[PDB]
Amino acid sequence: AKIKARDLRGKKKEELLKQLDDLKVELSQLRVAKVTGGAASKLSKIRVVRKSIARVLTVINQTQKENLRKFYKGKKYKPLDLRPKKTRAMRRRLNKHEESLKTKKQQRKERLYPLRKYAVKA
Amino acid sequence: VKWPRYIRLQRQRAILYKRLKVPPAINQFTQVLDRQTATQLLKLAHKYRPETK
Amino acid sequence: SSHKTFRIKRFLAKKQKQNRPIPQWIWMKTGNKIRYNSKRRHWRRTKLGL
Amino acid sequence: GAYKYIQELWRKKQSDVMRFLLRVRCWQYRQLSALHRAPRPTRPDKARRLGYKAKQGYVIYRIRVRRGGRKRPVPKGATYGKPVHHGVNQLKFARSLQSVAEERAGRHCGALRVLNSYWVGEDSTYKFFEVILIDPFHKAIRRNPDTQWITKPVHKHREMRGLTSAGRKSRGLGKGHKFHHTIGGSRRAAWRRRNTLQLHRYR
Amino acid sequence: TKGTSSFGKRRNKTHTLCRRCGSKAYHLQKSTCGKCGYPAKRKRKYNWSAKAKRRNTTGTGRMRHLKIVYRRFRHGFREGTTPKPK
Amino acid sequence: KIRTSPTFRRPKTLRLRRQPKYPRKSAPRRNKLDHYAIIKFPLTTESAMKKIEDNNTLVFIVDVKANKHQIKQAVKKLYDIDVAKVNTLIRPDGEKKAYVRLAPDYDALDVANKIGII
Amino acid sequence: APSRNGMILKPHFHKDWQRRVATWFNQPARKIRRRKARQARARRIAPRPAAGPIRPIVRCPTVRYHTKVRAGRGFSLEELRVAGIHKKVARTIGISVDPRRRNKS
RNA sequence: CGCGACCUCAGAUCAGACGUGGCGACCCGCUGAAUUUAAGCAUAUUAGUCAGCGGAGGAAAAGAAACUAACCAGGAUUCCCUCAGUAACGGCGAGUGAACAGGGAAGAGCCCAGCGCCGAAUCCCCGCCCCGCGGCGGGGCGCGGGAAAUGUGGCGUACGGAA
Ligand SMILES: [Mg+2]
Ligand SMILES: [Mg+2]
Ligand SMILES: [Mg+2]
Ligand SMILES: [Mg+2]
Ligand SMILES: [Mg+2]
Ligand SMILES: [Mg+2]
Ligand SMILES: [Mg+2]
Ligand SMILES: [Mg+2]
Ligand SMILES: [Mg+2]
Ligand SMILES: [Mg+2]
Ligand SMILES: [Mg+2]
Ligand SMILES: [Mg+2]
Ligand SMILES: [Mg+2]
Ligand SMILES: [Mg+2]
Ligand SMILES: [Mg+2]
Ligand SMILES: [Mg+2]
Ligand SMILES: [Mg+2]
Ligand SMILES: [Mg+2]
Ligand SMILES: [Mg+2]
Ligand SMILES: [Mg+2]
Ligand SMILES: [Mg+2]
Ligand SMILES: [Mg+2]
Ligand SMILES: [Mg+2]
Ligand SMILES: [Zn+2]
Structure with missing residues (x-):
């Protein structure tokens, strides 16, 4: 049967690992058939089983990563893979908050002398 | 004892102030208030300490 | 020599696997220009560096 | 204020008090390593004038450099060429010893930024300088909008690009008829334009 | 004597494969590489050989992180968002 | 306290242990050298068929990063057979060949029949 | 070798001048870029004048030009004080100010 | 002898951060020739140029006068035209060689230390509560911990400023 990624997401991790360990038995059985010499229908199923295993492992890893980022959602210190990976110089910038402070002198200067909107007659 | 460098350095810094001619503006700090007046001074100063946090 | 190291033996293994002729079915392809394998190596002629 | 008294006090370096203090401090710094951390600024009013603020993230390193000119690093005699360039002994380095001390501090402490430096003593073979260093990632510097310019990636290794005061004095820049050769960005920028x-298209 | 007879004694090697640059220029007896200078932290390159620089530049190899960086640049390095599902 | 020796040694201070406020990576890595990934395929060659028939062994192509212990405990789980000994070599192909000798009560060709090589 | 009659010319082409050659093929490209930047600024300050602040009446020094008059950098503090305009409010209504200027006359 | 401060200095797989290396067309700081020309050659010229070394950014550097001028005076920096192959340097030989004024492109100004006045009025970190939460921030608590009087913050900087 066609193993789809849409219907693996509602399943539990143990019944996902059961399907993974069944498909790995399927790969070992197909690779024995490859070296003994088998049908082309058995030979062309290797690519089918390999991508299904990639699909199951992708679903398992994506689910685990989503639960990890749900657990570390409100915490100050989180693991570096869950921290945002932009470029290194962009991660070493100042915050919105830090670039949006101005001193008490510049605060009263902007208050006392704002930039006026004006026009000059021709 | 072969002492470490910082111990040896501070100890022979303490000897250089006994060897070298100390000028009087630095020597005047060696002349100090004695044992009984200091306790009276700090006893008075304990009544005027600034407030804590 | 017979006293090889692991990295030298692995390099020799790869250079053994690249020394096979082209498969017969590749020049039935549409966008094909390869007539044969021009990167071939013989042990007597080209001495592989090292 | 006491700082005005300390400032005028350090201008009398030939007096008995200052010749005692400078000699004993030069002896003390001669017994330490070539580069080490000072726990506090030795000369606080001058550090304050150069931009040191006594708060967290401001670091002071004391450093010594060897005095004299620059011998040309060439084997025995044998600097091969015309008689103009046979000079080896009496040559002079184009940058000051304070500027050498700033980059020797800033290379060893590459996570910090050099602000300024000041002289604290010398003898026949060493000159002693203290360098003001700023941590650009401490929050006391990051959240202070007066000193958050140093955190920017433009100001990485000012002491190596000649943007501090000591390395700035050797570039020959300034306004006037005495500094015509650095009109533009620098001496090389004037040379490129000249x-x-x-x-042009129409000549 | 100095030529054909002398070439028969070449049986022990000076250089081996370098573990940083992959070229056979790691001098076994000086423990350094004549191509990249492996025990030095900085790779050796010079402006007197422009041809040697263009054999090892950022465009020479796989670019397995920089070519994803160049693609991610066009969307402002967006992260942690998905396209809207069906 | 007296200084018995004229040598000053650095006194041993207290060294605390790592108690991080966050793990550096979120999850432990999955063991990619799995029992299925460590054994790729057996050989069906005439040099391996005599090796199976006569010496009561099996011949496998295994992963190159595999120990004899790992090959032993991998055969014991995939094929439910204990191992007398494991002898490995590395081919000029680059692949690792493993001669896995079974117990005297298990028969290697009757194991080979159910796995497929015959 | 010199010819019969001519000038003694000193061409300054003894360095590697061919490396530092500035061609002007991007001159009509920079004129369009400056014009688009000028119009974008003029749309950004919508009722404010496109030239900017008003520049003062300024005599030129250095006797070849002492009869001409010119636009200066800014109005002086004496001029703003006589006119009754505060120096920190003048820059908000488009009056150019520089404090370096003196008024001898 | 012991105890408790402070100073100076160590050790930690201590808690949280940062740097290394690459590319390098353009930029900044050093170092730095000889071919060549002088019909030779040594000063000069090549040339502060090639090579060498260090450091960045999307631009860099410079930058708001210890300025130009000698006028009825201009007024930060950078770039273009002109000044100008000029003043000047030079075995005054070969050759080298700016700046001011003027016309434009652009145009934006500012902050400390000191000197003073305010009860350190200032800053950082950890625990808890709720929110924001993918550029780690906001208010509320903590007889919580530190930094700082060997000076943090507010006013205030040469155009004067404070009461
Ligand atoms: Mg202030
Ligand atoms: Mg041969
Ligand atoms: Mg010469
Ligand atoms: Mg040898
Ligand atoms: Mg390098
Ligand atoms: Mg003729
Ligand atoms: Mg730690
Ligand atoms: Mg030089
Ligand atoms: Mg000649
Ligand atoms: Mg000739
Ligand atoms: Mg000659
Ligand atoms: Mg170069
Ligand atoms: Mg770097
Ligand atoms: Mg970049
Ligand atoms: Mg800049
Ligand atoms: Mg000018
Ligand atoms: Mg003319
Ligand atoms: Mg002559
Ligand atoms: Mg010249
Ligand atoms: Mg001009
Ligand atoms: Mg204009
Ligand atoms: Mg103050
Ligand atoms: Mg000023
Ligand atoms: Zn190498």
């Missing part, structure tokens, strides 16, 4: 041929 030796760049402008070939």
Whole structure:
């Protein structure tokens, strides 16, 4: 049967690992058939089983990563893979908050002398 | 004892102030208030300490 | 020599696997220009560096 | 204020008090390593004038450099060429010893930024300088909008690009008829514009 | 004597494969590489050989992180968002 | 306290242990050298068929990063057979060949029949 | 070798001048870029004048030009004080100010 | 002898951060020739140029006068035209060689230390509560911990400023 990624997401991790360990038995059985010499229908199923295993492992890893980022959602210190990976110089910038402070002198200067909107007659 | 460098350095810094001619503006700090007046001074100063946090 | 190291033996293994002729079915392809394998190596002629 | 008294006090370096203090401090710094951390600024009013603020993230390193000119690093005699360039002994380095001390501090402490430096003593073979260093990632610097300019990636290794005061004095820049050769960005920027041929479309 | 007879004694090697640059220029007896200078932290390159620089530049190899960086640049390095599902 | 020796040694201070406020990576890595990934395929060659028939062994192509212990405990789980000994070599192909000798009560060709090589 | 009659010319082409040659093929490209930047600024300050602040009446020094008059950098503090305009409010209504200027006359 | 401060200095797989290396067309700081020309050659010229070394950014550097001028005076920096192959340097030989004024492109100004006045009025970190939460921030608590009087913050900087 066609193993789809849409219907693996509602399943539990143990019944996902059961399907993974069944498909790995399927790969070992197909690779024995490859070296003994088998049908082309058995030979062309290797690519089918390999991508299904990639699909199951992708679903398992994506689910685990989503639960990890749900657990570390409100915490100050989180693991570096869950921290945002932009470029290194962009991660070493100042915050919105830090670039949006101005001193008490510049605060009263902007208050006392704002930039006026004006026009000059021709 | 072969002492470490910082111990040896501070100890022979303490000897250089006994060897070298100390000028009087630095020597005047060696002349100090004695044992009984200091306790009276700090006893008075304990009544005027600034407030804590 | 017979006293090889692991990295030298692995390099020799790869250079053994690249020394096979082209498969017969590749020049039935549409966008094909390869007539044969021009990167071939013989042990007597080209001495592989090292 | 006491700082005005300490400032005028350090201007009398030939007096008995200052010749005692400078000699004993030069002896003390001669017994330490060539580069080490000072726990506090030795000369606080001058550190304050150069931009040191006594708060967290401001670091002081004391450093010594060897005095004299620059011998040309060439084997025995044998600097091969015309008689103009046979000079080896009496040559002089184009940058000051304070500027050498700033980059020797800043290379060893590459996570910090050099602000300024000041002289604290010398003898026949060493000159002693203290360098003001700023941590650009401490929050006391990051959240202070007066000193958050140093955190920017433009100001990485000012002491190596000649943007501090000591390395700035050696570039020959300034306003006037005495500094015509650095009009533009620098001496090399003046040279590029003066030796760049402008070939227009219509000539 | 100095030529054909002398070429028969070449049986022990000076250089081996370098573990940083992959070229056979790691001098076994000086423990350094004549191509990249492996025990030095900085790779050796010079402006007197422009041809040697263009054999090892950022465009020479796989670019397995920089070519994803160049693609991610066009969307402002967006992260942690998905396209809207069906 | 007296200084018995004229040598000053650095006194041993207290060294605390790592108690991080966050793990550096979120999850432990999955063991990619799995029992299925460590054994790729057996050989069906005439040099391996005599090796199976006569010496009561099996011949496998295994992963190159595999120990004899790992090959032993991998055969014991995939094929439910204990191992007398494991002898490995590395081919000029680059692949690792493993001669896995079974117990005297298990028969290697009757194991080979159910796995497929015959 | 010199010819019969001519000038003694000193061409300054003894360095490697061919490396530092500035061609002007991007001159009509920079004129369009400056014009688009000028119009974008003029749309950004919508009722404010496109030239900017008003520049003062300024005499030129150095006797070849002492009869001409010119636009200066800014109005002086004496001029703003006589006119009754505060120096920190003048820059908000488009009056150019520089404090370096003196008024001898 | 012991105890408790402070100073100076160590050790930690201590808690949280940062740097290394690459590319390098353009930029900044050093170092730095000889071919060549002088019909030779040594000063000069090549040339502060090639090579060498260090450091960045999307631009860099410079930058708001210890300025130009000698006028009825201009007024930060950078770039273009002109000044100008000029003043000047030079075995005054070969050759080298700016700046001011003027016309434009652009145009934006500012902050400390000191000197003073305010009860350190200032800053950082950890625990808890709720929110924001993918550029780690906001208010509320903590007889919580530190930094700082060997000076943090507010006013205030040469155009004067404070009461
Ligand atoms: Mg202030
Ligand atoms: Mg041969
Ligand atoms: Mg010469
Ligand atoms: Mg040898
Ligand atoms: Mg390098
Ligand atoms: Mg003729
Ligand atoms: Mg730690
Ligand atoms: Mg030089
Ligand atoms: Mg000649
Ligand atoms: Mg000739
Ligand atoms: Mg000659
Ligand atoms: Mg170069
Ligand atoms: Mg770097
Ligand atoms: Mg970049
Ligand atoms: Mg800049
Ligand atoms: Mg000018
Ligand atoms: Mg003319
Ligand atoms: Mg002559
Ligand atoms: Mg010249
Ligand atoms: Mg001008
Ligand atoms: Mg204009
Ligand atoms: Mg103050
Ligand atoms: Mg000023
Ligand atoms: Zn190498």
